[PDB]
Write a protein that binds this ligand. Structure first.
Ligand SMILES: Nc1ncnc2c1ncn2[C@@H]1O[C@H](COP(=O)(O)OP(=O)(O)OP(=O)(O)O)[C@@H](O)[C@H]1O
Ligand SMILES: [Mg+2]
Lengths: 99, 100, 49, 450, 349
RNA sequence: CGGAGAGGUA
DNA sequence: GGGTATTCGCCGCGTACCTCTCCTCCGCAAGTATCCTATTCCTTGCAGCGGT
DNA sequence: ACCGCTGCAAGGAATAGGATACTTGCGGGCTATATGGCGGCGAATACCC
């Protein structure tokens, strides 16, 4: 439904409004079972198990620096966007890195 | 080799060779014309980059690609690795009079 | 239509149905792949995952 | 207007009509004045105390501005052509005020010599000493001689050593700028603040608008640069455009009087105030050219300069040249056609052949007769019937008057015909209806919408 | 809906026509013009400038190519505002001094008008009658210009695509000067070569469209670049900002209080009236006129004439000014929506 | 023939 | 200078076999230039028209 | 019977809406960014004298 404003009127009016059942997209339909038919070949989209978006505090268990020093780190992991990480230099500093 | 649809396969080596030959012919013409130095300089930069990508692509941090955003297969990439000539066609190879 | 046909047709998680059983179909639909986009890689996954 | 006048005046005379190349930036702008401009903005100023004839065109945008205040000009510069009828000891005392030292073997900056007839200098600006050879109250040579060998490399006619920046840039002036800065503004520690930018040696983008700090003597109002006897000719009005420019400058000052980074001097410090500007235009003998009937008195006069009659042409009438063909018979005086370019003369020479008028080409407007058609090439933009001396000037923009089309056609609307459309709504549902812009539809009821 | 009804029959094969045009080109011997030293020295002396040592190299190449028994086909690719047009005039003089009917082809009406004025300016004493044919000239002027051309009295004819409309029959065509050829397609560039094969073509452009740049880089045409910007030109400072009324206002006032003029390129005809009204409410200090190639054309004549005479400052314009409008006072362009423009387009603007 | 991807046997 | 520290980019990571699918042109929008009818509006050419 | 002045009026000219040909971009188009590795090593800064 497309509204059209008029210019010289104050902020927010209507000249006309036109609506029309516009066609957009063909979405494949899941059959009665769970299989799609995509080009005549019957496909199945399996569920995926990924790390949940959020924030996680991990640490390599002294895998580096050979001192037994645990280098704690944090990841802010969005669902969609650019990641964010904080970590510790073996000198007990604190550095950020992006993507 | 034809793809059986009237067109031909990509065959990345010929693509790299066409790139190099095109830049080289253009630079030869532009050197014949005594063009100003700012133009011939980046022409020679382009030619150096093209021959670079022909001999060994990906040894620069930048690699040029065709389809699917993977870099092309250069003449050094046809020798290296598990799929080069040495490990896939010379040390061990497919054999006639054989069954399974 | 392009962004949807690309996902349904050619993805890593839209795969050809195993169909030599009723069991194979019904246990390939209830599959939990830990791979695909936004996930780990087959030959670079350690002993702990 | 100034630019326009610089083309018009040069058409009607031959004195050296010349502008004063202003910083093309806006008040407190962020751009540099493009050093080439300064090389023509200083040179004018160096000749200005002694120009003996000619016209200098300034707008009030530049007239209200302040400029380098003496010293720096007669200290850090030397312009001199061979036609400088000047002595030896005058240059001696001016270099004395410039602080140069009398050295017979000139080798380093700030050194000068006056021996016999030949004068030597090692200027502040360059690294080359020059031999001058004044004869008989006049300069005669520009001999580029070595720092030590005293052997001429080249004989030149005119020398230009101008500073390539409007303000002094050496270390002492930088220290002065910093000291005045700490006097007025406040320094913040940031590698982009202009205090540290200048201190590190670089000049920021709009550095010219922090001019007055560098000098420690107030900038002169540009009127000190005028000769002894000028005659300020005005145009239009000044006590209306100076005020407009002052208001706009104040607007820019408050607009950019934010941003603690890069702060600004008050407009009083880089511009005359309109009160001062009219304190100074009561110090020069003045002539105002204004386009309206001034009543009667001494110091007032009226020059009968009527406008041209209705001169226009159009291809609509079978006789297009009617206004001109009827004007040019009823005119006892001469007529000068003032075509724009050279080629346009031909585009006007084959159009006045259509009514048997062949214009001579004159050079100066006072070559016209009692009775003749002439044309001259310049850049004038509108005509006039000079009814004093009966002459007329018909500029080419008085043969192309106006365009008046788009007068349309009758009726773009019909009112109260087959369907009045009074419409206190009573219409049924499904009843055909006409929207004026889209045609026929079917009315399907009231509705409510967001 | 109905716009998809048209096409798909490839109604005409172009390969056969182009091959036959070129084949007729390569067979016929060219015209070898005659060069008079002093009689062209006077034309050089009328030039109120100095030919930079690359422009005077392009000019010498063009003349020594025209005075050869073959047929020229030269591209004069040189950066914008470097004086490519004076190459065209110093070749046009050599052509028409042998009574040879130059034909200049420009891809828009305003450029046609400007070139008409410039050519009348330059050839302002030599007896060569220059005329312009376009949609500005009315149908009682075209029907006389065409009769003149056919009888062979007009000796330079500057025209838009109206030139190549099959009713324009030159008597003795001797030189074709395509100007701003990164337009015109192909058939327009060849429609004048097709009628007279051995004609000499001098192709002026600043950013040649890729086909006729490759075809110059492979030897089919010659190429004579121009560098060494002429006298005191400064590289234009380019700024890329998100659109902002304050940026627009500051840019416009900086230009106007300098005294120059502004192209405010908008490139949308339906909304250009509202855009000019909005601009004139934003900047009361300016004088604003609208210029685009969909007016009654006696209004466009007036608008771009008044612009040349400083009668207004800001010109709210479409890309009709993309093709070499000179106006040496205009010193600020403001491209309204620069995201959808080609690299060549942005460079010409 | 190449590329990308999925899965399976020992 | 010079001894040692830290970081950074390149190298590598199993064999053999089997099965499957999926991989760019061509319409839209903007501008320009022209041409082509139909409608209406000056424009004057001719006939009227009363006056002489 | 002669004349200037105008009304009809035929057409002439300009003005609209429709069609066609270029240039440009956009955008998907049936062989044209991802972030879930790690270890070794030797060369290149770098740090502390
Ligand atoms: N050698 C020169 N020295 C100084 N000025 C020159 C020189 N050659 C040309 N000019 C000036 O520079 C301007 C360039 O305009 P011109 O049309 O001649 O070239 P152009 O603008 O690049 O061509 P186009 O109009 O096709 O873009 C002209 O006004 C001309 O007067
Ligand atoms: Mg040109």
């Amino acid at each position: 439904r497309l509204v059209i404003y008029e210019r010289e009127a104050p902020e927010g009016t209507v000249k006309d409004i036109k609506e029309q059942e516009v066609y957009m997209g063909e979405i494949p339909l899941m059959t009665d079972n769970g299989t799609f038919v995509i080009n005549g070949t019957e496909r199945v989209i399996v569920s995926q198990l990924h790390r949940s978006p959020g924030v996680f505090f991990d640490s390599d268990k002294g895998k580096t620096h050979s001192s037994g020093k645990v280098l704690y780190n944090a990841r802010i992991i969005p669902y969609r966007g650019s990641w964010l990480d904080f970590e510790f230099d073996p000198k007990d500093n604190l550095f950020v890195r992006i993507d | 080799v034809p793809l059986d649809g009237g067109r031909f396969a990509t065959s990345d080596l010929n693509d790299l060779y066409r790139r190099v030959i095109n830049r080289n012919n253009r630079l030869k013409r532009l050197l014949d014309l005594a063009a100003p130095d700012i133009i011939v300089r980046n022409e020679k930069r382009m030619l150096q980059e093209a021959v670079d990508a022909l001999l060994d692509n990906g040894r620069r941090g930048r690699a040029i690609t065709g389809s699917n955003k993977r870099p092309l297969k250069s003449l050094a990439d046809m020798i290296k690795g598990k799929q080069g000539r040495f490990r896939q066609n010379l040390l061990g190879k497919r054999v006639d009079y054989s069954g399974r | 239509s392009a962004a949807v046909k690309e996902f349904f047709g050619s993805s890593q998680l839209s795969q050809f149905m195993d169909q030599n059983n009723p069991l194979s179909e019904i246990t390939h639909k209830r599959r939990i792949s830990a791979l695909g986009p936004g996930g780990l890689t087959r030959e670079r996954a350690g002993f702990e995952v | 207007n100034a630019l326009r006048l610089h083309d018009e005046i040069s058409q009607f005379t031959d004195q050296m009509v010349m502008n004063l190349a202003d910083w093309e930036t806006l008040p407190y702008d962020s751009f540099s004045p493009h050093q080439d401009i300064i090389s023509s903005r200083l040179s004018t100023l160096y000749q200005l105390p002694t120009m003996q004839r000619g016209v200098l065109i300034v707008p009030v945008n530049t007239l209200m501005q302040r400029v380098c205040p003496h010293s720096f000009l007669h200290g850090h510069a030397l312009v001199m052509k061979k036609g400088q009828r000047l002595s030896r000891d005058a240059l001696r005392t001016q270099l004395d005020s410039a602080g140069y030292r009398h050295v017979d073997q000139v080798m380093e900056h700030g050194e000068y010599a006056t021996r016999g007839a030949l004068l030597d200098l090692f200027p502040m600006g360059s690294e080359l000493p020059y031999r001058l050879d004044f004869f008989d109250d006049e300069i005669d040579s520009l001999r580029v001689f070595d720092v030590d060998s005293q052997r001429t490399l080249e004989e030149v006619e005119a020398i230009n050593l101008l500073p390539a920046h409007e303000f002094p840039t050496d270390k002492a002036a930088i220290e002065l700028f910093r000291s005045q800065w700490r006097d007025t503004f406040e320094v913040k520690r940031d590698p982009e603040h202009i205090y540290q930018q200048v201190s590190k040696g670089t000049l920021p983008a709009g550095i010219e608008y922090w001019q007055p700090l560098f000098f420690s003597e107030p900038l002169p109002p540009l009127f000190s640069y005028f000769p002894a006897n000028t005659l300020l000719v005005n145009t239009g009005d000044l006590e209306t455009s100076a005020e407009r420019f002052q208001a706009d400058t104040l607007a820019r000052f408050e607009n950019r009087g934010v941003d603690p980074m890069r702060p600004l001097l008050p407009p009083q410090s880089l511009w005359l105030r309109v009160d001062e500007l009219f304190s100074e235009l009561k110090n020069w003998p003045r002539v105002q050219l204004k386009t309206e009937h001034l009543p009667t008195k001494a110091a007032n006069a009226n020059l009968g300069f009527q406008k041209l009659p209705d001169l226009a042409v159009q291809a609509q009438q079978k006789a297009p040249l009617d206004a001109l063909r009827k004007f040019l018979e009823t005119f006892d005086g001469p007529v000068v056609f003032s075509v724009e370019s050279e080629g346009r003369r031909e585009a006007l020479g084959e159009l006045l052949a259509r009514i048997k008028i062949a214009p001579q080409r004159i050079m100066r407007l006072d070559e016209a007769s009692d009775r003749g058609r002439y044309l001259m090439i310049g850049a004038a933009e509108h005509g006039f019937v000079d009814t004093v001396r009966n002459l007329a000037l018909i500029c080419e923009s008085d043969l192309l008057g106006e365009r008046v089309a788009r007068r349309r056609q009758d009726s773009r609307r019909t009112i109260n015909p087959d369907t009045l459309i009074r419409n206190l709504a009573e219409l049924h549902i499904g009843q055909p209806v006409v929207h004026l812009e889209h045609g026929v539809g079917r009315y399907a009821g009231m509705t409510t919408l967001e | 809906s109905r716009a998809r009804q048209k096409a798909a029959e490839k109604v005409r094969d172009v390969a056969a026509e182009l091959l036959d045009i070129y084949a007729q080109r390569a067979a016929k011997e060219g015209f070898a013009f005659k060069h008079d030293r002093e009689q062209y020295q006077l034309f050089c002396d009328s030039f109120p400038f100095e030919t930079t040592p690359d422009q005077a190299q392009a000019i010498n190449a063009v003349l020594s190519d025209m005075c050869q028994p073959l047929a020229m086909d030269r591209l004069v690719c040189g950066d914008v505002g470097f004086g490519k047009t004076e190459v065209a005039m110093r070749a046009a003089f050599l052509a028409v001094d042998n009574h040879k009917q130059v034909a200049v082809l420009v891809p828009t009406t305003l450029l046609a008008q400007q070139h008409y004025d410039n050519f009348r300016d330059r050839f302002a004493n030599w007896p060569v009658r220059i005329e312009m044919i376009s949609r500005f000239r009315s149908a009682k002027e075209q029907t006389q210009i065409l009769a003149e051309v056919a009888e062979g009295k007009i000796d330079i004819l500057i025209g838009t695509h109206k030139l190549l409309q099959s009713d324009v029959k030159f008597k003795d065509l001797g030189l074709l000067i395509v100007d701003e050829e990164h337009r015109f397609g192909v058939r327009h560039k060849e429609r004048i070569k097709a009628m007279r094969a051995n004609v000499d073509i001098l192709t002026l452009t600043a950013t040649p469209i890729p086909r006729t740049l490759n075809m110059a880089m492979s030897g089919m045409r010659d190429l004579s670049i121009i560098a060494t910007p002429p006298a005191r030109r400064l590289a234009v400072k380019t700024f890329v900002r998100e659109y902002d009324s304050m940026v627009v206002r500051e840019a416009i006032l900086r230009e106007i209080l300098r005294g120059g003029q502004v192209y405010y390129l908008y490139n949308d005809v339906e909304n250009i009236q509202k855009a000019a009204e909005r601009l004139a409410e934003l900047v009361p200090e300016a004088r604003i006129a609208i210029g685009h190639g969909q007016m009654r054309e006696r209004e466009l004549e007036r608008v771009m004439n008044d612009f040349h005479h400083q009668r207004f400052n800001v010109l709210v314009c479409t890309t009709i000014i993309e093709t070499g409008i000179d106006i040496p006072t205009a010193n600020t362009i403001i491209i309204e929506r620069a995201d959808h423009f080609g690299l060549a387009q942005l460079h010409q603007l």
